[PDB]
C-alpha cells in the first residue's frame, strides 16, 4: 500500500506541475500587454496608429483563452473553473496514503479572460486600447491581472512543496 | 439585582411521597453499592448531564474561565500604566537631542502594543473555553434562569471586545447576534455599533474579491440595519444625528421610484 | 484556636461594595432563611439589614489529572457566617466595630460523575465564642449519596449516619477522632476562608486607591498645555 | 407590547403618494375585498374610498449561496393594515390622525423549486387594539404542499393543520409554543413593518421639501447678472 | 505554511504501526489513553514502559489547541514572533527524537545480552 500510495504522489506531482506548466505562458502573455498599454497611454499616437496596438491585443487576449481551453491533464480540463471552490463541477483529491481516509483537495481556480477581470462575465467584451484614455484604465487591469495569477502559482508551488515531503516521509 | 453574587446557576438540595420515594430508591442503589463499576452502556449515564448538579457544576467552570480571564485584561492595563510611570521618572541622563525623544517614545508604544496584543489572546482562550461550559449544559429548565443570562452576556461581552483587538471582526458575527436575543441587551447602542463595523469588514471583503452581489446587499442590508439602530438608541430618534445616518444609508442602499 | 476573632473582624463587608472577586471566590451578604439552614441574597446589597457572609470556595474534580474539562468531577468547598444586631447607621465601611457570630456552617461538598459517588458533609457550629470547648454544638452531618435525608440525626446503634453533634465521637487514644478532626479539617479551613475575607476587603480598597490615582493623575497632565 | 399601537400611525400612506420605494419591496391601498380576506388595489390611490394598506417584501431562494440568479424559487413576506371608516375631508397627507385597525393580516410564502417544497403561512388578528390579551382572536392557517386546501379548519385529529386560533396551542414549559410564537416570530415580524412603513413615508415626505428647495436654487441664478 | 501546518497534523493521524497510532499522543505520559509494554525478558515480571509524546500542531504550539487558529505569516510584525515558536517547536521534536534513540539503545543491548 505505502509503496503504491508513494507513487500516486508523484501521479499527483504530475498533475500540480503540468497545470503550473501553462500559467507561466499565461504569465507571459499578460506582461506583453502591460508594456503595451504603456505604448499606447501616450498622446503622441493617432487613432490609426493604436489600432494597430490593438490587433496585437485582439490576439493576445484570444490566446489566452485557448490556453484555458486546451489545457489538459489526463484527458481532464483544468483551469476552466471545473476544479474551482465556489462553483465546481467535479472535486481534485488526491490518495497520498495506505489506509481509507487518507486524501486531500487540490484546487485549480478559474483563468480564462473573464475570470482575470480583462473580460466581462456578462457583457462579453475585452479590454481595448484604441483610445488614449482607455489605455491608461488597461495598465491598471492588467496588474491585478497579473496579481492573481500570481496568486494560482503561489498555491500550485505550495502544495507541489507539501506533495514532495509527503512522498519522501 | 445581581445574578452572579449568587454564585450557583441554582441552588439545589420536602413532600412525604416524594420523601418515600427518596427512601426505597437509595436502599436498592445501597444494596448494589458498586463504587468500581462502570456501566458498559452508556446511555443511562448520560441522564446525570440533564442533572442540576452537572448543570451547578459547568456553570463554576465557565466562570472561572471568565474571572481568570478577566484579570489578565486587568493586569494588562496595571502593567501599561505602571511602565509609562517608570518611563517618565527614570532619568534621561543621555538625551540632549529632539530626535532623541521621538525614537524611544515610539520605541515604548511597540513594547506596550506587544504586551496588549499577548493579553489579549492570553485572555482569550479563557473565554473561548467558557463559551464551550455554557454551550454543553443540556437543562433548559436551568437555560432561562437570571444567572445563565447574566453570565452568558458577560462571557459573550468580553468575547467580542477581546475577538475585535485582533482583528477577527468575521468571527465575531455569530456571537453578537446570538448576544441581542437575551434580555435588554437588543436596547444597548454598543452591541449594534461592532455589528455595524463586522458586517462592513464582510461587505468589503467580498467587495474587494469581487464576489456575487447576493452577499454583498445581505451584508450590505444587516450593515444599515445595525448602523441605524444603533444612532437611535444613543441620541434617540429624530436626532440631528439620526437624520445624517439616513442620508448616507439612502445613497448607500438601493430605492425605486 | 483564636481564629473566631479574626473572623468577627469580617464585619466590614456589609456596606462595602466588592467587585474584585479573587479567584475561585464568591462572596455576598443576606438575611438568614428558616431555621438558618441556608441563606438567600438580599436584593439590596448595601443595606444594613444583612447579617450573612457567605464566601463560596470554587474546585473541582479531575484538575489534578488534568481532565476538568472532560466533565468528569464536581466539588466546591463554602463556609456561612450569621451574625447578630443591625449594623451601624454610618455607611462608611471603613471604621465598624466587630460583631459577634451568632453561628458557624462550614458546607464542604463532593461529587464525582463516572463513580456516581456524591457525599456532602455540612458542619455546623452554634457557639462560634465565649466557649473554647464547644464540642457539644457542633452539629456534623454527613450524607453520602441521598443516605440519610437531610437533618436526620444520629442514634447510638447506628453510628456516623446524619447529623451529630461533635460530642457523640469517641476521644480514645486509640481513636482520637476530636483532635484528628481538627487538625486536619477545621483549623486549616477557617485560616484558608479567614485570609481570604481579608484579601477581599483589601482588594477593594485598593480599586479605591486606583480610583483616587486616576482623578488626581488626570488633574496633573492639563499643565502640557 | 404596545407595539400595534405604533402601527395606527400608518394611516398617513393614504394620501400621500408613493413614489420611493426600497429594492424588493411593494406597496399599495385599496378597499377590503369579499369576505374581507385580503385587500383590493383601487384604481385610485388617493381617493378617500380606500381604507387599506398593502405592503409586499419579496425575496430570492438561494440567496444566501449567491445562487439567487439560478432561479431555485420564490419566497415574500408580506403585511397588511385594515382600517375602518372614511379618510379626512383635507387632502393633505402631513396632517392625519391615528385610526384605529379593524385586523392585521400576515402572509408569509416560500417555495423551493428543486426540493418540490411550499410553504404557505397566514397570520391574522382581528382584535389589533383594545386587549391586550387577546390570543383567541389571531388566526393561524398553515398549509403545506397545497394541503390541506384553504379555508379547512383544524381538526382535532390533525393538530396545527389548517385554519385555527392562537388558544388552541398550549403554552407548557415543555413544549411553550404560545411564548415562543411571540417571542420568536410574531414580536419582531411586526417592528420589522413598523419600521418600515415609517422608512416609506419619511423617504417621500422628504422629496416635498426637496423640490421647494429646487424652486429656490433656479431663482438665485437670475443673480448673476 | 496553511499546506505545511496541514501536512503536520496528516502526518500525526496517519503514523500507525501495526494499527496502532503513534504520534497522535496515544502513548503520552501525562494522560495517555494506553501505554505500551515490552516484554524483554521470561519471566512473570520483566517489562519496561514505552512513552511516544503528542506530536500533532497543537501539542507543536504551532496551532491554539482552543480555536485551532494557527501561526500568522502574513504580517511582517508576527512574522519576527514565528521564528520564535519555530525554535520552541524543533526544541519539543528534538527532545523526543532523543528519547526514541535512548529507548532504541536500552533494546539494543538488551537484545546482546
Known sequence: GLRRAEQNTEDGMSLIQTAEGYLQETHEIVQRVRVLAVQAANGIYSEEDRQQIQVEVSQLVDEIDRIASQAEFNKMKLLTGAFARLNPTASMWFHIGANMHQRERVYIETMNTAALGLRNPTVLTFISLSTAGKANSVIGLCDDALRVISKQRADLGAYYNRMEHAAKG | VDELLKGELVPENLTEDQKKKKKEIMEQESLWKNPDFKGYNKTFQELHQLSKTFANNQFRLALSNYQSGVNTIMKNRDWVEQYRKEEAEKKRLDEKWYWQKVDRKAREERVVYREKMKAKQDALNYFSKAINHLDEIKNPDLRERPEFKRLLSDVYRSWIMAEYDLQNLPQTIPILELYIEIDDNEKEYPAHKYLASAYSFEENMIKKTKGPDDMLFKYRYKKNVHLLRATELKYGKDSPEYKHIVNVINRDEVISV | ?225
Not at chain 3, 115 to 124: G, R, T
Not at chain 3, 182 to 204: A, R
Request: charged share 30%; with cysteine; net charge positive.
Open chain 3, 1 to 225: 484556636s483564636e481564629v473566631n476573632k479574626r473572623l468577627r473582624l469580617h464585619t466590614v463587608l456589609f456596606k462595602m461594595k466588592v467587585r474584585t472577586l479573587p479567584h475561585k471566590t464568591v462572596l455576598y451578604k443576606g438575611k438568614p432563611s428558616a431555621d438558618g439552614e441556608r441563606c438567600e441574597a438580599a436584593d439590596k446589597q448595601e443595606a444594613q439589614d444583612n447579617t450573612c457572609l457567605h464566601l463560596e470556595v470554587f474546585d473541582f474534580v479531575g484538575s489534578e489529572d488534568g481532565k476538568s474539562s472532560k466533565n468528569l468531577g464536581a466539588k466546591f468547598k463554602k463556609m456561612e457566617l450569621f451574625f447578630e444586631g443591625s449594623n451601624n447607621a454610618d455607611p462608611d465601611p471603613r471604621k465598624e466595630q466587630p460583631r459577634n457570630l451568632t453561628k458557624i456552617r462550614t458546607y464542604i461538598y463532593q461529587n464525582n460523575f463516572l463513580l456516581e459517588d456524591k457525599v456532602i458533609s455540612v458542619i455546623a457550629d452554634v457557639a462560634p465564642n465565649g466557649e473554647p470547648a464547644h464540642n457539644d454544638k457542633i452539629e456534623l452531618f454527613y450524607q453520602h449519596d441521598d443516605y440519610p435525608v437531610w437533618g436526620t440525626p444520629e442514634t447510638p446503634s447506628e453510628k456516623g449516619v446524619g447529623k451529630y453533634i461533635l460530642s457523640n465521637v469517641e476521644n480514645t487514644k486509640s481513636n482520637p477522632i476530636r483532635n484528628n478532626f481538627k487538625k486536619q479539617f477545621y483549623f486549616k479551613n477557617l485560616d484558608y476562608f479567614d485570609k481570604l475575607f481579608t484579601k477581599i476587603f483589601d482588594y477593594n480598597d485598593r480599586d479605591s486607591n486606583k480610583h483616587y490615582k486616576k482623578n488626581v493623575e488626570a488633574l496633573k497632565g492639563s499643565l502640557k498645555y
